[PDB]
């Protein structure tokens, strides 16, 4: 809403219901913790394109969403688990130095 | 210097480790067969 | 560093690879056709140094037989038989490939267990194309003779009707177009005087038939009719010994590619739906639509009509192709439950990517041709968020939906701050992932009395990570050739004696090391045959 954050701390809320599996939604955010006032659904419909942009929510059949499996991942498409040593070993592979 | 890496950097796995083998051989036989 | 990271496109790594295995005296010459598109020997000779007449004729006959160039034969009028020499490009992708050929055989030939031509069968590999060209008696003129090779010999039928073992032409020795050339006046050896008007109708007539030609001299290496001899006497089948005959990679491509297009299942799905889809590919790629698509690699492709054409008839094939489209009922058997055939492709048909969609109902096929464009889009956006920070990847999605993007609506539209966003933003026009369009509000285009807008351009952002690929390959050969310039002396002692104690420990760290190099080679390929399905 405001300019300043707290509104990815508001989002990380909204993302739990789904992953077990867009007036639904408006029932599920409303509870003690919330504060923001008045959480109109034309910020609802905003705020649920973000998680499409991070990958983390899927947008079907005009109003439905569903996740991702993005939660598995939370925890070769897997770049965690994946350490570089980078010291001592001068064969490395960079994204820079070519241009 | 340059910064900004690949994130493909790890240990080499036994499943390509006998993988890797096949390529030194290769040449091997290559520049000890005919040219 | 720098001497390389600048000045060198893909011809250091073309160079490299005949530097890697490969005497040194080609390197250069297979440098100067890239470097000059088209040359002869008679100006071969001037444009080198260093090498004779006669000395090129023995050298050119080494990477002829490895099918590193192909050929090609013009007379004039006037002039005598001129040898015009082109180049190849997916004859030293062997060459390039050569260690994961030796892993398809293993991992598609799955009906062995516990073999005893396990070293055998991976030496084939090692013969049929590291030799050159190989022919049946070849191998049986062998240190062994007979010693039991019917098992081997009937073997290699298995091996060579599961495909890519197909009989050598000059269709292989030659490229594509300079044939072309020959079959289209082929197609126009009309006297004019015969129906002279229309005459735009006269190339259309020339054109029709000439493409009813180049798809049948298309099937001539897959003319599987004569690639093999009924035997009447003490063998069941056998090809014939009389063909020569070399691996190519068009299963290996396509073997690559389904071998690629599992890798989305183990993240749209769980483990166990990714299990049943590797069944439900690996009976299409025996006969599947051409992923390098040979007919459209130079012709009418420049005229919109033509180019409508190209895709009009390649959807048709692959909608009503006989030798993919499975009848969703056979495969419950090759699994190692009916209801569970129509409950596990169900999520096929609710997933958001275009794999088996569209279909007579009942029946299922693949879809090909609206697929890997996603799967190009797919890798290639996560790319982005792997090496800088993932605010880059809101910022990449935000794109192609928001078409021509302000920096008025990206706050509408994504959430972050003022301060991180011009930082990332930046860091990816420098990437070109983004194509900046100025607009002006003055006269001769004032840049202060101006805005700007944003564009994805799915083009020159896909075009720019290939290259940044291809040079990343050979930079890790280029690394590999100066590890054996260097220690160079105990290698010969150690390549001389098929000991001295302490000598022993610098044999294993340069060992180890480059170990390392075959492995990460192995993972950038992969990152780079996805972008070639073009």
Redesign the interface.
Known sequence: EL???F??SLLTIVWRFISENTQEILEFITAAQVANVELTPSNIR??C??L????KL?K?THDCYRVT?ES?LQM??N?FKMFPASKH???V?Y?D??? | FPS??????GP??NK??S??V???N??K???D??? | ?LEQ?TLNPDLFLYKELVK????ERAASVIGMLVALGRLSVRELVEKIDGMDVDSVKTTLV?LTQLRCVKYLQETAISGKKTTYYYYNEEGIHILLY???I??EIITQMRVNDEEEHKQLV?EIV?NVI??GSLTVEDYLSSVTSDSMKYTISSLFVQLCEMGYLIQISKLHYTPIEDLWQFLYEKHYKNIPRNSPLSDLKKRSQAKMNAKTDFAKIINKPNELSQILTVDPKTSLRIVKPTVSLTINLDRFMKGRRSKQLI??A?????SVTAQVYKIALRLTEQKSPKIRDPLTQTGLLQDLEEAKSFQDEAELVEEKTPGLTFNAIDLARHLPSASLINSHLKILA?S?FPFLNETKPGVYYVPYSKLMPVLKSS?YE?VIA???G?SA???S??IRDNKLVSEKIIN????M?EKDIRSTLASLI?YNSVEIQEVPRTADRSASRAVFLFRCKETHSYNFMRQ?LE??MA??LF?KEKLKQENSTLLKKANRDDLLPSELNQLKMVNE????????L???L??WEVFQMA
């Open positions: 300019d300043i954050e509104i990815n905003s705020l394109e973000v499409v942009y991070d990958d899927e079907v499996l598995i070769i498409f770049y070993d001068k064969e592979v994204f130095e070519w241009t | 900004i890496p690949l994130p493909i950097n080499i796995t390509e480790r993988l890797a096949k390529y030194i290769f040449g036989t290559v520049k067969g005919p040219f | 560093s990271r890697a295995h490969l005497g080494s050569s260690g994961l030796i892993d991976a090692q590291s030799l890798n989305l183990k993240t749209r799905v769980g609710s958001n890798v996560y792997s090496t800088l993932p990847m809101r910022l999605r935000c509408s539209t994504a959430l701050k420098r940044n040079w990343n930079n890790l690394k090391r480059e170990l390392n190099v075959f492995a990460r192995s993972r950038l992969s990152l």
